[PDB]
């Protein structure tokens, strides 16, 4: 301890065979900053060890913070790296973290910073497992106030494969979604069944006026054994004008089973002129 | 169809009486203040102001000049965009910024990002406008004309055609 302020280093060395335990820490005292490290590596073996390094330093109106620990067991892994960096107002928040396993992996990205008092966010999770790929992505700029949402979540195997997207914004009045799902689904058990997904979806309001439309078809095909050829083939799409002076919406459903269909077509009227619906229910059936 | 009422006929007359009524009382204020010279020539203005204004108000075209506005305010949020409005906040950021900065010279600063969010994305349907039929002191009726019910039935085993109508007598009001 000095007028120059205080000074505190210390090392514990300790091994015998496999073991060895190497730590030290050095903490140094230098007027209005901070120096900070401690090193800390545990071998037990040499594929099986632990590593810890934690450095921080305190300086006149910055933070600076560095964290990286390493971890292994002969056939499995794990890493991690965070930086955090911080003044003020600014905020910056990155690093890594994976882990894995022979093949099998597991990638996860993210960073978080702020900046113009508006905060950004992005994270990316891949995952790579026996063959399969799962990709979700949650996209940048989540601003947090009049903000916006994008993601992109996508999944991959020979029987299914699936594939999503979305995007919508939450500024102060307009509203808009923008949903499109495409599901393609191979399967055999007891003769092939291919799932078959189309669905979309869309949004959008705004003051005194909302409308939308829903766009689905739904059609399946089941080749089971006993030569039974069954196709699921529903078609439904929906819209609808809303607003104060004039109101109406609509319907059209398509199902059929095989041979047997039923359609039914409707639509609503709300008007300063008049209120009406209109249906045409035809059927298709078999058996006496 | 357009429903008035002698108590209707009563307001707007209480109402033009008693707007006279003060305009003859503002005038008389007026008259008493005229009775260091640009304060006196605005409160001359001021008074002519309210005077003026008042002889302007009637309730009927009061409540047509809400609704303008309203049916205008509407017009305007509606055809909103987040672009525009956005650099109009940076706009007035950057008015401020340099403002508080000329009477300092004459504090850090302040920002907004310009932000754009039409890129990503573009509405493909169509809104229709807002319409509101105006606002008078009568009330506004869209007289009952007619009701009617279609039905049709088609299968061999067996036909069906029934119709139902039933409507308003609007041959005269009295009957």
């Given at each position: 301890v000095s007028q120059e302020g205080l000074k505190l280093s210390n090392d514990m060395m300790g091994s015998y065979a496999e073991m060895k335990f190497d730590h030290t820490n050095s903490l140094n005292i230098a007027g209005l900053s901070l120096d900070f490290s401690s090193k800390l590596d545990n071998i037990y073996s040499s594929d099986k060890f632990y590593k810890q390094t934690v450095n921080l330093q305190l300086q006149p109106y910055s933070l600076v913070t560095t964290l990286n620990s390493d971890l292994k067991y002969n056939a499995l892994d794990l890493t991690n790296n965070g930086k955090l960096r911080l003044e003020p107002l600014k905020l910056h928040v990155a690093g890594n973290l994976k882990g894995a396993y022979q093949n099998n992996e597991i990638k996860h990205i993210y960073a978080i910073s702020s900046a113009a008092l508006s905060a950004s966010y992005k994270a990316d999770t891949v995952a790579k497992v026996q063959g399969v790929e799962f990709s979700h992505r949650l996209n940048?700029?989540?601003?947090?106030?009049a903000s916006a949402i994008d993601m992109s979540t996508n999944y991959n195997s020979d029987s299914l494969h699936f594939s999503n997207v979305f995007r919508s914004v939450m500024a102060p009045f307009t509203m808009t979604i923008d949903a499109h799902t495409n599901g393609n689904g191979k399967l055999a058990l007891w003769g092939e069944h291919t799932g078959q997904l189309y669905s979309k979806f869309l949004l959008k309001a705004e003051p005194l006026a909302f409308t939308f439309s829903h766009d689905y078809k739904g059609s399946t095909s089941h080749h089971l054994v006993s030569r039974k050829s069954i196709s699921a083939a529903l078609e439904h799409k929906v819209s609808a004008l809303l607003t104060p002076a004039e109101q109406t919406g609509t319907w059209k459903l398509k199902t059929q089973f095989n041979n047997n269909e039923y359609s039914q077509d409707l639509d609503a009227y709300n008007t300063k002129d008049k209120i009406g619906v209109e249906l045409t229910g035809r059927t298709l059936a078999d058996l006496t | 169809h357009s429903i008035n009422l002698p108590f209707f006929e009563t307001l707007q007359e209480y109402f033009e009486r008693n707007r006279q009524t003060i305009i003859v009382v503002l005038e008389n204020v007026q008259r008493n203040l005229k009775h260091i010279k640009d304060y006196f020539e605005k409160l001359v203005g001021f008074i002519d102001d309210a005077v003026k204004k008042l002889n302007e108000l009637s309730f009927k075209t009061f409540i047509e000049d809400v609704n303008k506005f309203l049916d205008m305010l509407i017009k305007k949020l509606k055809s909103f965009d987040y672009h525009q409005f956005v650099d109009e906040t940076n706009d007035k950021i950057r008015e401020v910024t340099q403002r508080l900065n000329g009477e300092i010279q004459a504090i850090p600063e302040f920002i907004i990002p310009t932000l754009n969010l039409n890129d990503f994305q573009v509405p493909d349907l169509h809104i229709p406008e807002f319409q509101l039929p105006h606002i008078s002191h009568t009330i506004e009726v869209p007289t009952f004309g007619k009701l009617y019910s279609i039905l049709k039935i088609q299968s061999p085993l067996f036909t069906l055609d029934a119709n139902a109508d039933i409507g308003n007598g609007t041959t005269s009001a009295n009957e």
């Open positions: 940048t700029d989540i601003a947090g106030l | -």
